[PDB]
Amino acid sequence: GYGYYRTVIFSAMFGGYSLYYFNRKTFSFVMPSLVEEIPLDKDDLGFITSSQSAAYAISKFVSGVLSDQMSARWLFSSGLLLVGLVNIFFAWSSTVPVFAALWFLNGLAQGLGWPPCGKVLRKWFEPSQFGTWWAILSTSMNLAGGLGPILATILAQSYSWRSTLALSGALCVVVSFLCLLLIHNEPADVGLRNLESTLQELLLSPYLWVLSTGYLVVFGVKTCCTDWGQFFLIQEKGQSALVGSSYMSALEVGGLVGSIAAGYLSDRAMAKAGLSNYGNPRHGLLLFMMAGMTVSMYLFRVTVTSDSPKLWILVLGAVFGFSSYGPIALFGVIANESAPPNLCGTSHAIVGLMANVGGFLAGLPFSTIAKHYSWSTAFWVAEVICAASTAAFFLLRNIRTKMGRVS
Amino acid sequence: GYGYYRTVIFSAMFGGYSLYYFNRKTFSFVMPSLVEEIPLDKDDLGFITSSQSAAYAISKFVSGVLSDQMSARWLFSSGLLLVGLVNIFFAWSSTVPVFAALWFLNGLAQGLGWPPCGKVLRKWFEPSQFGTWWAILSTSMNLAGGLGPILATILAQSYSWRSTLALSGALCVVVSFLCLLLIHNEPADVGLRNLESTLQELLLSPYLWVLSTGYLVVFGVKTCCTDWGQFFLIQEKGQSALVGSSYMSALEVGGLVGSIAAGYLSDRAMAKAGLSNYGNPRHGLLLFMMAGMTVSMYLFRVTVTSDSPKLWILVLGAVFGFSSYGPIALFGVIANESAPPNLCGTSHAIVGLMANVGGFLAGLPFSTIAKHYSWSTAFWVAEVICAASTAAFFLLRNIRTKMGRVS
Numbered sequence: 063g064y065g066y067y068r069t070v071i072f073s074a075m076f077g078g079y080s081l082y083y084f085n086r087k088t089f090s091f092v093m094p095s096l097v098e099e100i101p102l103d104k105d106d107l108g109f110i111t112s113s114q115s116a117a118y119a120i121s122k123f124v125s126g127v128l129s130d131q132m133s134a135r136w137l138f139s140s141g142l143l144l145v146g147l148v149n150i151f152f153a154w155s156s157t158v159p160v161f162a163a164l165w166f167l168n169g170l171a172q173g174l175g176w177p178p179c180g181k182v183l184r185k186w187f188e189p190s191q192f193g194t195w196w197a198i199l200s201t202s203m204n205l206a207g208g209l210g211p212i213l214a215t216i217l218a219q220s221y222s223w224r225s226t227l228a229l230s231g232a233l234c235v236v237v238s239f240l241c242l243l244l245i246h247n248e249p250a251d252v253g254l255r256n257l258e259s260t261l262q263e264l265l266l267s268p269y270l271w272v273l274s275t276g277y278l279v280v281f282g283v284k285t286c287c288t289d290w291g292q293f294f295l296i297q298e299k300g301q302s303a304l305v306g307s308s309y310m311s312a313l314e315v316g317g318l319v320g321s322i323a324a325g326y327l328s329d330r331a332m333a334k335a336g337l338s339n340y341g342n343p344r345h346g347l348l349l350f351m352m353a354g355m356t357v358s359m360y361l362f363r364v365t366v367t368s369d370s371p372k373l374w375i376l377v378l379g380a381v382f383g384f385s386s387y388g389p390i391a392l393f394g395v396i397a398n399e400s401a402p403p404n405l406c407g408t409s410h411a412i413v414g415l416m417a418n419v420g421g422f423l424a425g426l427p428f429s430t431i432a433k434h435y436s437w438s439t440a441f442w443v444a445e446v447i448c449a450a451s452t453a454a455f456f457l458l459r460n461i462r463t464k465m466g467r468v469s
Numbered sequence: 470g471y472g473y474y475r476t477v478i479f480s481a482m483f484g485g486y487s488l489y490y491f492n493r494k495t496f497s498f499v500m501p502s503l504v505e506e507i508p509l510d511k512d513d514l515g516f517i518t519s520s521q522s523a524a525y526a527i528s529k530f531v532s533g534v535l536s537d538q539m540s541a542r543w544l545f546s547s548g549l550l551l552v553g554l555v556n557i558f559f560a561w562s563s564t565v566p567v568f569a570a571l572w573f574l575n576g577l578a579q580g581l582g583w584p585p586c587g588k589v590l591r592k593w594f595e596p597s598q599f600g601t602w603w604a605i606l607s608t609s610m611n612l613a614g615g616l617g618p619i620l621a622t623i624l625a626q627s628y629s630w631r632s633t634l635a636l637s638g639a640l641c642v643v644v645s646f647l648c649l650l651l652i653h654n655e656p657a658d659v660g661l662r663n664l665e666s667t668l669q670e671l672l673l674s675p676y677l678w679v680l681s682t683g684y685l686v687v688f689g690v691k692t693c694c695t696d697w698g699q700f701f702l703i704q705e706k707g708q709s710a711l712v713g714s715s716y717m718s719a720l721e722v723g724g725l726v727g728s729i730a731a732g733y734l735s736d737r738a739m740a741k742a743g744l745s746n747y748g749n750p751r752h753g754l755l756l757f758m759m760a761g762m763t764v765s766m767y768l769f770r771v772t773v774t775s776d777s778p779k780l781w782i783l784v785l786g787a788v789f790g791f792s793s794y795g796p797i798a799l800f801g802v803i804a805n806e807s808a809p810p811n812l813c814g815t816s817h818a819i820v821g822l823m824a825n826v827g828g829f830l831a832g833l834p835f836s837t838i839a840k841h842y843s844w845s846t847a848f849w850v851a852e853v854i855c856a857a858s859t860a861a862f863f864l865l866r867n868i869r870t871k872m873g874r875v876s
Binding site for chain 1 (some may be wrong): 852854856857860861864865
């Protein structure tokens with residue numbers, strides 16, 4: 063059928079991108095067994111994970127640019143096969159630069175996998191049903207991150223790290239051929255019906271860069287609170303470490319439900335509206351969630367004391383996680399929808415570049431401001447940036463969103 | 470007395486800075502008689518006035534930096550004497566590079582005059598009485614611009630341009646010695662009572678750069694509407710040229726009363742409040758006037774047709790002029806108040822540098838956006854910048870405003 067093939071292809075992308083994220087962070091999942099086996103420095107593990115982070119940033123960008131050129135099926139399957147071959151060779155490795163370079167090459171093949179999922183979700187799913195299945199295909203990532211330390215801890219208690227990495231790499235090699243056989247990058251290959259723009263016309267469209275600065279700010283404020291919310295509760299607000307861990311756990315669970323609810327309710331808005339070329343029906347919940355970020359950072363900064371209860375901290379974590387991982391899924395969905403259909407992966411990679419810029423701006427200058435002035439001053443600077451960007455994106459909510467040529 | 474010397478010194482600065490602005494724009498006031506006398510190109514006059522504009526920008530900055538080093542009395546009097554000597558030599562000039570270089574040197578000596586007025590108004594007037602006399606000392610500039618073409622047209626009908634420039638230069642030479650004799654840069658020279666910070670501690674204070682970007686945006690939007698409001702009424706909105714001229718005249722008259730009302734009501738707020746080091750009681754009307762800019766640009770963009778009456782255009786011009794020249798006087802008053810007392814001219818020159826940046830951003834890119842997309846799209850981009858900066862400055866209204874060291 064039609065929806066049958068949508069189900070089959072989404073199950074294949076779900077399994078493939080779940081194995082992507084599990085084999086993206088297996089070395090951090092099997093890390094305790096491996097540091098029991100071989101002694102490695104904290105700076106050594108930081109260099110390995112930083113090699114993967116640098117290669118994954120470069121490869122998200124390069125793969126988004128490539129995914130609009132060659133086929134998403136072969137690119138996805140090649141990514142999964144090459145990730146599996148990396149984990150096979152990584153289980154078959156003992157020396158440290160082999161770990162670092164092979165995990166760099168895993169970071170490349172992990173970047174090489176999600177813009178195929180974006181292209182296939184664009185070409186196969188209606189815009190009334192695009193954000194919700196984007197959000198479930200990122201819930202694949204969240205489910206891999208949730209079931210990864212559990213299964214890796216069981217396989218590291220039972221077997222070694224080499225046997226676990228070898229089984230996971232062999233599983234990716236098998237699922238790479240299964241995703242080569244169960245994915246069609248467009249319905250024109252089957253026979254079903256589908257659903258002229260240059261990269262210069264993409265880059266000169268101002269909505270891509272309004273979207274880029276918006277996702278810069280939203281991912282920067284997400285990474286600010288995700289990295290330093292425990293520290294803001296320990297040093298400044300005077301909570302315990304269990305309260306900070308519960309705050310992070312509530313932010314993650316609220317972020318999972320925030321991404322899913324953002325996709326579903328934004329597809330409801332996209333199904334209701336959709337007559338004009340200017341504006342975007344997804345702004346009508348992207349703006350409410352960015353205002354939710356503003357309200358959550360304000361109420362977490364001024365209405366949190368040492369005497370405020372743990373339930374208020376959990377509510378602020380959950381509502382900020384809702385209001386924060388919602389817009390990240392929405393800037394993904396908009397950078398894939400509002401783009402031309404043959405240049406949507408490139409328009410998504412341009413916004414992931416600003417994800418990298420926001421990650422750096424949340425890492426070093428936010429910690430510098432927190433070191434010099436105070437913690438509440440730094441989180442307030444992040445609040446001002448997020449609220450001023452919520453205002454600047456409320457103003458810019460009705461610009462020409464359909465990127466590309468003008469007709 | 471005390472208020473007697475405040476009256477005498479303010480009358481001397483009023484006469485001196487009125488002759489500053491009259492001898493700043495005498496060559497554009499006596500321009501028709503001079504182009505009847507000698508033939509000059511439009512590009513030639515543009516080069517002469519651009520030489521004065523470049524030298525006056527460089528000299529506003531250099532003189533603000535200098536006015537905190539040497540005395541404001543001798544710097545003011547030297548500026549007025551050197552402006553008078555330029556107009557004497559300019560009346561005694563015939564050839565074109567002599568005009569251009571001597572008017573460059575006038576632009577230098579015109580920049581060399583207002584930061585002495587800022588220093589004397591800081592050292593002599595209370596913060597409850599500082600913004601209103603700042604606004605009257607800029608009403609000196611507006612009165613010179615209002616009575617300048619009238620008196621210059623009368624003196625160009627009666628006498629020549631050489632006789633008019635010679636009388637105006639001789640008047641500046643006389644009033645330079647009268648302002649050397651009737652100004653005291655601080656009350657410590659008389660005997661009355663007055664009312665430790667480095668430039669690095671100025672530049673590292675974030676309120677100077679919040680104030681700089683705020684004045685960047687406010688002066689840029691002022692220069693956008695001041696240059697292109699007639700063009701927005703001619704090409705886009707379909708008004709006549711008389712409606713655009715009345716719009717500019719209503720914006721200028723409303724701007725005069727806006728600067729004066731901003732100074733007076735902001736000094737009322739500064740007199741009422743004043744207990745804390747964070748925030749500024751002048752924000753409590755700077756924000757209302759920046760929101761007045763936002764509301765005025767919105768109501769002038771969406772609620773102006775060809776069938777809207779001329780009275781609505783005059784009301785929008787007057788309310789935008791109010792809401793626009795108010796904040797320019799207020800960013801001057803705040804860059805002179807919130808600064809340390811021996812480094813206030815430098816903190817004001819740093820904000821005049823961003824006036825130059827906003828003038829360029831209103832000149833070329835605003836015209837480029839208006840050429841490519843539309844006129845309403847360009848004025849809407851200016852509206853978005855002004856409203857997003859009004860939001861970002863409403864958030865940043867309670868940062869540490871007292872620039873300098875922390876104690």
